[PDB]
Design an enzyme around this catalytic site. Structure first.
Site, short mmCIF file in Angstrom:
data_model
loop_
_atom_site.label_atom_id
_atom_site.label_comp_id
_atom_site.label_asym_id
_atom_site.label_seq_id
_atom_site.Cartn_x
_atom_site.Cartn_y
_atom_site.Cartn_z
N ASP A 29 6.96 18.11 39.21
CA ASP A 29 7.61 19.39 39.01
C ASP A 29 8.41 19.70 40.27
O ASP A 29 7.85 19.77 41.37
CB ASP A 29 6.55 20.48 38.79
CG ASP A 29 7.14 21.82 38.47
OD1 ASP A 29 8.06 21.87 37.63
OD2 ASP A 29 6.65 22.83 39.03
N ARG A 82 7.89 12.66 33.36
CA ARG A 82 7.48 13.96 32.88
C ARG A 82 7.73 14.10 31.39
O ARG A 82 8.84 13.88 30.91
CB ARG A 82 8.18 15.09 33.61
CG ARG A 82 7.59 16.41 33.19
CD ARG A 82 8.06 17.54 34.03
NE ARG A 82 7.48 18.81 33.60
CZ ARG A 82 7.61 19.92 34.31
NH1 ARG A 82 8.24 19.86 35.47
NH2 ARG A 82 7.08 21.05 33.89
N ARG A 84 1.47 17.89 34.85
CA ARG A 84 2.70 17.12 34.88
C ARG A 84 2.74 16.10 36.01
O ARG A 84 2.15 16.29 37.08
CB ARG A 84 3.94 18.03 34.91
CG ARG A 84 4.23 18.69 36.24
CD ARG A 84 3.19 19.72 36.69
NE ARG A 84 2.98 20.75 35.68
CZ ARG A 84 3.65 21.90 35.62
NH1 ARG A 84 4.55 22.20 36.54
NH2 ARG A 84 3.38 22.75 34.65
N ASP A 139 10.77 22.59 41.55
CA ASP A 139 11.30 23.93 41.35
C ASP A 139 12.25 24.26 42.50
O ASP A 139 11.92 24.08 43.67
CB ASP A 139 10.16 24.96 41.38
CG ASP A 139 9.26 24.90 40.15
OD1 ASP A 139 9.65 24.31 39.12
OD2 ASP A 139 8.16 25.48 40.24
#
Ligand code: APC
Ligand code: YH2
Ligand code: CA
Ligand code: CA
Ligand code: CA
Ligand code: CA
Ligand code: CL
Ligand code: CL
Ligand code: CL
Length: 159
Positions: free
Chosen positions: A96, A83, A93, A98
């Site tokens: 990711d 990334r 990207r 989260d």
């Protein structure tokens, strides 16, 4: 042990390969075990739309790490999977990760805001979460099933 729920997204550099690699790396996070992996979903990009479709998924991770310790590992994994930060807000990207939820905890540190600030408005987070945790209740008492019953979200298609 607390169950954390992590959203996964990738839209660069072979998303299926990125997400499978991420699952291996998530397993290798210390003090932690993957309990459940959702299906993989092919989702149209929201926000900026001039990018490839996302692979989105969710995982349930049982952990005794502190919340920011978990963030340390998820950031490490993203960086180790190439990334790169560019100037455009919400750019595409490779990976990711989260942190959507960390048990029933409400966390507001400099590095970490949990529940994820916008997850209740994102089908690409909520649908895979419902697949793995249909009984989920948010820290504010809202039920995941009730959000998905009431609110208009586009149907997700599997990858
Ligand atoms: N719940 C959470 N999970 C992961 N990172 C979080 C977070 N809350 C805050 N952050 C912080 O968010 C910072 C920026 O992360 P980014 O990945 O660039 C945002 P994004 O995921 O592209 O958009 P989004 O947050 O609108 O989904 C991280 O460096 C991290 O410190
Ligand atoms: N509306 C809207 C909106 C929704 C999300 C975002 C954050 S950037 C972003 N991540 C993702 C993601 O994981 N999946 C999809 N399908 N679109 C995304 N867009 C920005 C704006
Ligand atoms: Ca582990
Ligand atoms: Ca753009
Ligand atoms: Ca995100
Ligand atoms: Ca992120
Ligand atoms: Cl792929
Ligand atoms: Cl990237
Ligand atoms: Cl909440």
């Amino acid at each position: 042990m607390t169950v954390a729920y992590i959203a996964i997204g990738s839209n660069l550099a072979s998303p299926l390969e990125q997400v499978n690699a991420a699952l291996k790396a998530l397993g290798d996070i210390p003090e932690s075990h993957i309990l459940t992996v959702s299906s993989f979903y092919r989702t149209p990009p929201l926000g900026p739309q001039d990018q490839p479709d996302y692979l989105n998924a969710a995982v349930a991770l049982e952990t005794s790490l502190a919340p920011e310790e978990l963030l340390n590992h998820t950031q490490r994994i993203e960086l180790q999977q190439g990334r790169v930060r560019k100037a455009e807000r919400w750019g595409p990207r490779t990976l990711d990760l989260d942190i959507m939820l960390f048990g029933n905890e409400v966390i507001n540190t400099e590095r970490l805001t949990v529940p994820h600030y916008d997850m209740k408005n994102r089908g690409f987070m909520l649908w895979p979460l419902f697949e793995i945790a249909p009984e989920l209740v948010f820290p504010d008492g809202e039920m995941l099933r009730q959000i998905l019953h009431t609110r208009a979200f586009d149907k997700l298609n599997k990858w």
